Structure formats: structure tokens, C-alpha cells
Amino acid sequence: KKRKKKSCTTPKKNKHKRKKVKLAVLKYYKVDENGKISRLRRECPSDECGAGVFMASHFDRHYCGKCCLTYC
């Protein structure tokens, strides 16, 4: 049995390529004229990411990337 070639299928399943965000770290904090710090999103209650990591505001939900926490 010489091994058959047969490569045909739904032509390509492409693999997710990383979305490269340029200086996105800066978007989190809002600096006023005095030099004050305004946090535009919510802090996460979980232990590992506590006080060092923030959450995401999607329209209907809040999502932290470490422990995968979700709220409405």
C-alpha cells in the first residue's frame, strides 16, 4: 500500500494571528492637568490579579484576562 496523497478539503482554516496593539497600555489611565490619576475601568476582586490588574469594559460585560472573571 503506497500511501495516497489526497490533500483536499475546505481550502484553508487560517489560524488566529495576534492583534498587535501599539502602546495600548496607555489607554487605561486618564491624566488631568494637575497630574492626577483617573482609572477609567474597574478593579478585579480575585486574589492573583488583585490590585495589579484591571478589567475590560465590553458593552454588556466586565472581563479580566487573568482569572477570566465575568460580570454584567
Binding site: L23, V25, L26, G35, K36, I37, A51, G52, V53
Partner: protein, 123 residues
């Protein structure tokens, strides 16, 4: 204190490299430094981003942290330990670090003699 002020960051960043207490890059610096678990922070002066100054200056202002400023991201990249070296010891490759956050110091009379003096005179 026999040392010069500008040359003596080498011992702070060396012992902080040996004790695994350095956080480099802006987000792993800012965040973990805002965790009030990290003592002091080292920043680059020359930068192409105006807000990159606002972030760290505001953060170091409110969170009771001290600010050092260096010339280029390149020299700081030689301090951080990201410089890759040649066969004979030429510091050939340089990945520059503007953000450095110190968590765990080593115990040194030298780097602490210059940093504690510079920051006793700055206050």
C-alpha cells in the same frame, strides 16, 4: 561614598537582576509597581511618546515612589541585562528599556550609598 552618582545604578540593577526582582516593559512595570509591592522605579528621559512621561510621573507621584531618569533607552538597555554580547565581549545587541521597576533589592553598600545619598539630597 567614593562612587559617582550616574555609574552606581549598575549595582542596584545587578542585584535586582540576580534576586529576580526586576520588572521591565511598561505594563509589567506600572501594574506591579501600583501593587505597592515595589519600592523604587527607573525611567528613561528621551522618548518619542509624550504620554509615556505622564503615566509614570503621575504614578510615581501618587503612589509614593521615587523617580530616576536616564539619558537614552539604550544605556538603560545595557543596565537591564538585555544586551547580547559577541565572542570577545562586544556589547553588540541592545534592546532598550525605558521602564524599570524594582521589587527585591540585593544587599549592597555601594549602590545604596549613591542612591540613598542622591535621594537624601533630592528630598
Amino acid at each position: 561614598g567614593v562612587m559617582d552618582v550616574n555609574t552606581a545604578l549598575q549595582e542596584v540593577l545587578k542585584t535586582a537582576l540576580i534576586h529576580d526582582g526586576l520588572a521591565r516593559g511598561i505594563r509589567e512595570a506600572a501594574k506591579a509597581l501600583d501593587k505597592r509591592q515595589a519600592h523604587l522605579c527607573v525611567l528613561a528621559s528621551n522618548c518619542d511618546e509624550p504620554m509615556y512621561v505622564k503615566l509614570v510621573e503621575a504614578l510615581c507621584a501618587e503612589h509614593q515612589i521615587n523617580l530616576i531618569k536616564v539619558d537614552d533607552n539604550k544605556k538603560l538597555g545595557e543596565w537591564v541585562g538585555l544586551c547580547k554580547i559577541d565572542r570577545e565581549g562586544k556589547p553588540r545587541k541592545v534592546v532598550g528599556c525605558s521602564c524599570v521597576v524594582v521589587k527585591d533589592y540585593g544587599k549592597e553598600s555601594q549602590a545604596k550609598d549613591v542612591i540613598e545619598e542622591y535621594f537624601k539630597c533630592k528630598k
